[PDB]
Design a protein around this motif. Sequence first.
Motif, PDB file in Angstrom:
ATOM      1  N   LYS A 173       0.857  -1.176   0.000  1.00 51.87           N
ATOM      2  CA  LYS A 173       0.000   0.000   0.000  1.00 51.87           C
ATOM      3  C   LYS A 173       0.902   1.237   0.000  1.00 51.87           C
ATOM      4  N   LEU A 174       1.179   1.743  -1.196  1.00 49.82           N
ATOM      5  CA  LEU A 174       2.210   2.749  -1.382  1.00 49.82           C
ATOM      6  C   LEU A 174       1.660   4.157  -1.361  1.00 49.82           C
ATOM      7  N   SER A 175       2.343   5.025  -0.622  1.00 46.82           N
ATOM      8  CA  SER A 175       2.024   6.433  -0.572  1.00 46.82           C
ATOM      9  C   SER A 175       3.336   7.183  -0.669  1.00 46.82           C
ATOM     10  N   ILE A 176       3.456   7.993  -1.717  1.00 50.06           N
ATOM     11  CA  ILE A 176       4.684   8.701  -2.045  1.00 50.06           C
ATOM     12  C   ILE A 176       4.275  10.129  -2.338  1.00 50.06           C
ATOM     13  N   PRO A 177       5.034  11.113  -1.816  1.00 48.20           N
ATOM     14  CA  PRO A 177       4.721  12.504  -2.129  1.00 48.20           C
ATOM     15  C   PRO A 177       5.053  12.836  -3.576  1.00 48.20           C
ATOM     16  N   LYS A 178       4.166  13.588  -4.215  1.00 52.86           N
ATOM     17  CA  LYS A 178       4.403  14.124  -5.547  1.00 52.86           C
ATOM     18  C   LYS A 178       5.332  15.316  -5.365  1.00 52.86           C
ATOM     19  N   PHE A 179       6.537  15.264  -5.914  1.00 57.72           N
ATOM     20  CA  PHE A 179       7.465  16.373  -5.667  1.00 57.72           C
ATOM     21  C   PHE A 179       8.397  16.773  -6.807  1.00 57.72           C
ATOM     22  N   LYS A 180       8.718  18.062  -6.854  1.00 59.32           N
ATOM     23  CA  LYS A 180       9.668  18.605  -7.812  1.00 59.32           C
ATOM     24  C   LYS A 180      10.735  19.411  -7.077  1.00 59.32           C
ATOM     25  N   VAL A 181      11.974  18.931  -7.096  1.00 60.67           N
ATOM     26  CA  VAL A 181      13.057  19.588  -6.372  1.00 60.67           C
ATOM     27  C   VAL A 181      14.146  20.044  -7.338  1.00 60.67           C
ATOM     28  N   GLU A 182      14.561  21.300  -7.203  1.00 57.95           N
ATOM     29  CA  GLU A 182      15.660  21.845  -7.998  1.00 57.95           C
ATOM     30  C   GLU A 182      16.704  22.477  -7.079  1.00 57.95           C
TER      31      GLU A 182
END
Length: 365
Positions: A271-280
């Motif tokens: 049961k996977l939960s991963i944050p949607k993210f954009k890092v620069e």
Amino acid sequence: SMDALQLANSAFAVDLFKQLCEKEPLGNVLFSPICLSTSLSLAQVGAKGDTANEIGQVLHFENVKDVPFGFQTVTSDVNKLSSFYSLKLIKRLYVDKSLNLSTEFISSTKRPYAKELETVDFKDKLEETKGQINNSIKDLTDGHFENILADNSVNDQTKILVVNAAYFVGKWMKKFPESETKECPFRLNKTDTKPVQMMNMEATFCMGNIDSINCKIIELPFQNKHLSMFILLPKDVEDESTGLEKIEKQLNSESLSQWTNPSTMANAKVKLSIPKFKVEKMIDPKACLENLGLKHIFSEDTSDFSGMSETKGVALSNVIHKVCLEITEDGGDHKDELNADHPFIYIIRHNKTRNIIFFGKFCSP
């Protein structure tokens, strides 16, 4: 097999990750250890004596045989992979024209570091140069890195400039269903919270959990298994100082390899939960590199670059390293749970060679 250059590359990655951790204890660290190792190894070929030796020891090339051919291999793999993925690992080493490079250096370099070295006129036409370098990298990088040089004071005294520009817009092997993404609290620590777009699915993944470290490790393959993300999630929520202390004591080259080896892991319906993210992130690795033991490279007095040039006063003047990672739902078509709703270290690796290409920690949305 002396693509034991992998081990060297990940040792150095851990080392430099610890340094970056020290410098941004609460920040989302992201960097591309492979680009830096590649650029410095090229610099090494032009160095002699202690300068060359220092690069060798810091990058952990001690017991790697043909280093150049090793990178020749990893670069080609990566450049190929760049025709399937939204992936660019651009590495340039810019030398000034006033340092007439030796033929032996150029021929020693053509193949292993193709296109990665080019000579420029920093001294006289600096502003033109800077304009050209920016646009070249803007294009080399498909428009993402607009003005790579623009806060790094590249001056007309620049002798050798290293720029690393890298980005990745992940495409998973198993997509997250868009409709199941929803806004959720990310736990920054034991008390504090901040909103994230949590992506959610239930699928089969190679997963493990170490009792002693109290860590959950999951492998999330990108499309066709060319690259995999490894997420290292502590089981319990912890204060920053604690989790930062663990990074200082727990984490090391050998350990990262062991907890991240998919043969340590079992197949699980998660049961996977991963944050949607954009890092620069952009870094100036100079200070951190010096802390690992790289002095001579940066000083024009003590550095030895006879291998590449016989102009005195040659040094690595400046190092620019900018990395951008975007992760979304975008992908192809026993039980456990993995809910990354608090800080986690992540690495993205090249599965064939096992080299780390992106290394980071997600600390807050």
